Design a binder for this molecule. Sequence first.
Ligand SMILES: [Mg+2]
Ligand SMILES: [Zn+2]
Lengths: 477, 72, 51, 1337
Amino acid sequence: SNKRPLKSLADMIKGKQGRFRQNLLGKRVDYSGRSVITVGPYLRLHQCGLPKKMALELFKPFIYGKLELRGLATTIKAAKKMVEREEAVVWDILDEVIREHPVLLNRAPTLHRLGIQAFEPVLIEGKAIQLHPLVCAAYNADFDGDQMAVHVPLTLEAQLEARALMMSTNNILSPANGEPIIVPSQDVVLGLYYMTRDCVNAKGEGMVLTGPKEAERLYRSGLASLHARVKVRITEYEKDANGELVAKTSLKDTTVGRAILWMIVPKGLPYSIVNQALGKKAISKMLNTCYRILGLKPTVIFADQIMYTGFAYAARSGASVGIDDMVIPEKKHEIISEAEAEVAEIQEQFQSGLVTAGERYNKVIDIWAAANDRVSKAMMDNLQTETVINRDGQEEKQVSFNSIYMMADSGARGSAAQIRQLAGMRGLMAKPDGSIIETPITANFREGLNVLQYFISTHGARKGLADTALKTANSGY
Amino acid sequence: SDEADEAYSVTEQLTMTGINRIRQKINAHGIPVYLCEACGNPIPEARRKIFPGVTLCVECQAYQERQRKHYA
Amino acid sequence: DMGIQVMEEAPDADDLMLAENTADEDAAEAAAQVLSSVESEIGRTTDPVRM
Amino acid sequence: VYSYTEKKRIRKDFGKRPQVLDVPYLLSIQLDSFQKFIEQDPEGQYGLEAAFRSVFPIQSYSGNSELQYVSYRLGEPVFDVQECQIRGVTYSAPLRVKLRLVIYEREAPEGTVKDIKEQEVYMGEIPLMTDNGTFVINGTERVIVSQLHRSPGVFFDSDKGKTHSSGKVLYNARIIPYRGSWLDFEFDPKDNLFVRIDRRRKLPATIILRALNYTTEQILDLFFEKVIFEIKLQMELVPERLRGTASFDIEANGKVYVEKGRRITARHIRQLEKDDVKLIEVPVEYIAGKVVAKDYIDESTGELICAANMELSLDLLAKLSQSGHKRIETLFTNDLDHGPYISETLRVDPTNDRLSALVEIYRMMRPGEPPTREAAESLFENLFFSEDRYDLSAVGRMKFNRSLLREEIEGSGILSKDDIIDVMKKLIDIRNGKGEVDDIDHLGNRRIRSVGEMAENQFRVGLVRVERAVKERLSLGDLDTLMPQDMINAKPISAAVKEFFGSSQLSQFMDQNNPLSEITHKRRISALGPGGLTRERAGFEVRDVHPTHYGRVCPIETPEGPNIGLINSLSVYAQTNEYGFLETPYRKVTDGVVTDEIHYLSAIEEGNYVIAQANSNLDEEGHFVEDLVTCRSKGESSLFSRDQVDYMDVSTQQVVSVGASLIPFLEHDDANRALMGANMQRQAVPTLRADKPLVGTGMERAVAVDSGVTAVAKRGGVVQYVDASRIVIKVNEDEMYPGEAGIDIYNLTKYTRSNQNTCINQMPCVSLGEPVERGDVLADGPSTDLGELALGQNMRVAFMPWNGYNFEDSILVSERVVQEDRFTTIHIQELACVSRDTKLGPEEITADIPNVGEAALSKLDESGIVYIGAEVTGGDILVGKVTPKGETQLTPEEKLLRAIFGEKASDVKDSSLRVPNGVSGTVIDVQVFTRDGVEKDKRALEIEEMQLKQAKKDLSEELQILEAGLFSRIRAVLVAGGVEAEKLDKLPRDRWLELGLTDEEKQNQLEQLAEQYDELKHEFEKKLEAKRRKITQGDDLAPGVLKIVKVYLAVKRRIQPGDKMAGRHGNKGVISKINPIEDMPYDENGTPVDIVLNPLGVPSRMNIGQILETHLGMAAKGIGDKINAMLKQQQEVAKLREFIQRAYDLGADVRQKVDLSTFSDEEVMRLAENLRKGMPIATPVFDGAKEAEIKELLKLGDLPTSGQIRLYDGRTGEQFERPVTVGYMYMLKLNHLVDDKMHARSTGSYSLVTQQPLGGKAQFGGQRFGEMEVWALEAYGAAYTLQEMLTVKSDDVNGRTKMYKNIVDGNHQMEPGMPESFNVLLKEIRSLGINIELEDE
Ligand SMILES: [Mg+2]
Ligand SMILES: [Zn+2]
């Protein structure tokens, strides 16, 4: 009684609306539920903040069994009414039931098996699931409104499969390549970079501390600055043996933050692991060498301590972002005048029949790409260093503590290309066809774009977004 | 991911691959050929100073550009 | 069924590589042996109403 | 001069560019379009008149009868929009159509009619579009989106090399008609021109040129140039031809012109043209490759030596030469420019003449049938040149003539020979390199429909359906007494319009989140829908932004996700052509002077002009200040001299849409961030109390007013009486309309439910005895503030990491924002209790409910419904309903239980309406609907008497306010000339409509106003009577439902973790913590930061607009707090005037000017009190504040120019190193709430056929564990996890219950059995002829 065909037996089996496709594998499942994930940066790698209300719904039969086991509820109906009123002992029973009972957290595009991990629930107020920061890389989850589905293992065998097999502290290496998948992402690496990064003349230069404890006590009382090159006495333990762990103490030259951070590194790791700036790859390699020396328990502990200290010293960093942090180079309009002169000369030669049309197009596209490279190079050489004084009193160049640059150079977020678009010029823009519009964007974002350049950028922007929206459709083919 | 960061990567790849194609078509460093490979004519001095390493005069070049405009 | 997927518009370059190809080749032979013969008999029909 | 509601709070405005065209009425599309539809077109070409004229006059079988259309009108509806929404119907109007039937006898075909009959038959109801461009279709408010479909005309497009292996592009030209066949021409890979008629078999293109009665000589005359050789073997020369690689060298007069082998060049072309070379000589071998042009015969026998289009070889050269032939004509078939295509097509072309060509066409169209000369000719002439089978519409002919570059915008509707020969020449010219293809997303090929045109089409469909029945009924009998009421039943005419307005992809629920969302949803263009492309077939084609979108479609605003570029938003000043093509205004530029008058240009015209930029500085006389002004010509932008430029953009804003025009510093954001920011501004739910943006643009007042949320005055006057529910205005006497009573009333829309469960609620702004002028807002709508669009609240934001609490995109909100109720939103949701009649009897709304124990029934009144005033929680019974049922044989031990306790069975289910879980609101309202059979209950009679008293009070209170106003006007009439001024008040007010006065026209005025108040009285009386009839009359409830009780639960959602805040620059987040106020960062003055943000979000996401906005909001708030300090220490208005006037003129040559010197001393105190929270600031979209003016405005306050202050940690109190950026960013609460998302389930409902847990949160459903989650579980070893997700937690009906029993037993073991999905699969395979089975274990 429509325009569409009727569905038949062969249709009742085949097709994605058939039985095999999405009723024989993809099924709706009980003891489950989803919510909106938040950070919860205090958790450990093995736990997730479960809301009290989701936890009281999923673990309902377990709670009923507890109330009737402990006598707090005469029959299952009385327990039902208790946990319906949400009395005062249903909460103690929740704490007891949940105690060692993992929950599977899963996010929608399960591209790999790390899009499912067993976590121990930590009951929290509110209605958002709190997901560990170092797990977002596996989940591909940011905290701008994503949601997660929690499932509850029901059997002892599934409880032991979650604990023994899928627990978040077991899966830390990418199954595609054994590099650890617990790399700290953006506030963490910026914390560890800011603290592990010296400057030429800070408070307390060239003190000889007694060790990392004294460097921390000095910094926290504010007598020394977090990057003030001091001689510090370091005892590092090297398993250079049949696993014997010989100790060796010496006097290194490190910043105060280098030594404050040495307090968290476990025994088997050398001291050169923290004695440099510690951007992003430095931290991933730090976790990796800790794993190749010490194994899994020290590496999980190390990862948690790294996240904690990175977040703490990044908050103490006070690393904001301003408008004066986009240092547009002064030689930008000189370079653009020279490039504009070159395109005017090439257009004059083309008008005189010396070149063809497409030939001159190629020439001008090349001129603009080259001038864009000079502007980007000039701006990054302006941004990547700064002058400072000094023990004896003379000016001395050190790496810049500019904030946009510190974020791009610590590996925390950003890179010199987006930096170029922020303070250097924007460059030439594509079209959806792949052709290149030969009228460049000589402006940046610290300046503005006018209506025409903001229109021209829209071409490549909409093309990129239209592709990323459709790649999302067939993400897992 | 944010759905605009991946869009950024796509746009970056698109513009870069276009820019470098149109750059490779220039072949600035080259050989002094001094005479057209189509009509043997004298490639005038200015065209060899602008484009070091041309192989066609402007007439044969524009001719070839028309055809390669359509295709084949 | 051959199969070649008669479309209305030409497929994109990626849609050739990504599109799974099935399924040779017994049905290939059967389909070809039907198509080689269909061109000869003209009055052939399938509706019971036309018959 | 400033408006009186404008001096209340003046937004300081940067934006030096002076504004020339003021922004249009943003909803002109919907309202104009529906105006053209339902409106008396006298010279009928629009709307209903055109459809009626197109079906009528119907004429009967053999012309015995004629049904003739006289006229129409729209009967006024039964209920207005509010009554429609309450009652739940479509707010429409009856279409009463006066028709006429004339009947003819013998010998009078046109002759005298035996008799005619007039009658006004009623043909369906058309829905009425409200004053906002929205419809009410089933009580809900729809919006009909404008469509964007290809237009009739000729389109030149190529495969761009994808199809053929060599890459050779193949160009086709398609003539798409309005109705008719699709002529199409297209190249072969061999470059032969083919033509296909309806996507049918390919024929040679010149077959149709022969079908149009041409011969080969004529075809070659049309498509080619005749290189004429003469006689020896001399060649006439056109020097331009031999551009060049030159065959023969070149020579004339014997000396030389050019030597052979070397390519022909411009210098030697110059030489030939200069020396005047007409005749040169070529050998007998160069003529061996050319093509003969025309017939050539021997006079001796009259025999054909060579036809036309025949290759010319040396033998035929000799044969013609011996025939005394001096002249020879050859096709000028160059290889690059003048390619030979008609020649080769005539080679492949098997036919020769019009007969055989027509036969070929006939065989292709109507195949197999034996053709004739007559049948073939008739088919071909009926293809394109019979007026009743091929129509290029007015749009189609406009585009066909303009696309061929002709100056006849208007013309025929059928094709012609010349309209095909020009198409073929243009095709061949595109192939020759002169000319380009059409772009498909070009906005000169796509035109817009709207409600008027789509609804008119549906009405025409209904009219053709009517014509069928009327023709046949005038076929049978045609007997007298048969009138134009029995022939036309309104159902199938109204059926199409109903189906469209309700069930269509374009009729979609208006988004009411806030006013801006509605304004954008109405100004929306869609490529989808019936008539435009589908999501599956689109591309890759029209998702892309195109240069013709400038000024017409917003490049920013469009949804990201499944359809980018398929749903664009109309630009600010975009308009629709006469024909339907989008267009945009430009101020015309005479010689150098930028003239003032403005023309609208569409994407077809806009190319061939040179259009300056809106950001082009000018002298005062209108000249340009720059010699080379950057303007965009046809596709690109370059520097043109100031003499060349013809038009100039009307404004800097004219490229964006009204959504993306509300982003301050939009120029500093990456375009996709602007896309996200606009799309998220559409989603901001209105907070409890509005807060205007400290950094706006000046678009907010326009968006707030032009949408129907704020009640705007119609006439100036004084605010006679204000109230939380109504505003009464006593008009200025200049605007009285002398018949009128004088005062006009605005009734505010109090707490009501929008489509998204938000609260729409208008608040009065004015106060008693305060002036107003027409256009001033009286009532602030939901999410506006003193007339401006105020979406969220401006927060004191800090940019800094803070302990991993704003880590990926999270936000760290202070408890102080949670205390001030800044982001607290009132939500409203309606819950329906339907009592129907089941097959064992009806169900009651009683309060004598089963087992529930006299506490849950405490809220319920006697009739069983909750009180209006009660605060329920999740689980409370709103409406107690008990349902009949059978016995069902309670098992033993239940028998034994009830026998021991004597609690006999109920027989009646407790299927009542209890509040959903998690909600806790106040029950603000209860509507009841009893069918006319069901009598009524106590609550129903109570609510009816309450509505009765309200209706009577409203009518009388209106009438007495109006009576008092009219008596004031009458008393002002009675002040002179038959005057009583001191005894006028003596006699009673009712003894004034009989008041005396001298015999003037003003005693006429008194008597007139008196009898007009009498009109007020009597029409108030009929109002009361009709109101009581409607309130009392029974309801037309659905079939079977005895009565519907609707409770309206008003909840108040507060900010909490998991809620999604968001900025206007694509910076979205999710509150992760609600920090105590003493745990937050503070400055050196004791001021915590309200919200903490990640600085990491800004560099990678190139939207530094949020930083410039934070700086400007710091400056604005600094100004405003300095004002607050002055205003609180009671600094005199000398000080306030000085400082406020110094802050209102900051920045280099801004357009705005305010002079507080011309300001009443009380209007500076009001203005100061409104600027004491912060000085609002505007920053037009590509015109706003430069960073140096931000810095200056920071120096005006005592804030630092750098924008970064030094902050201290809340918990320890030790200063953060390297100061942080803190300013005021304007945050918005997006309608993605954490309690609309948090869902969970242990064990609930299970689906009927497939015994899985139900799907969704409304069904209390389970989670879809799909195929990829199964691969993830298999990639671990979790064999048991998977076996129970697939068996016990999903589908195994007998193992799920055993798992539950075991879990409450404290034994965690599953006996899984076998899934019901596989059992159903086995039975469904077994119900085919296959025998599938499970072997012995
Ligand atoms: Mg996300
Ligand atoms: Zn040459």
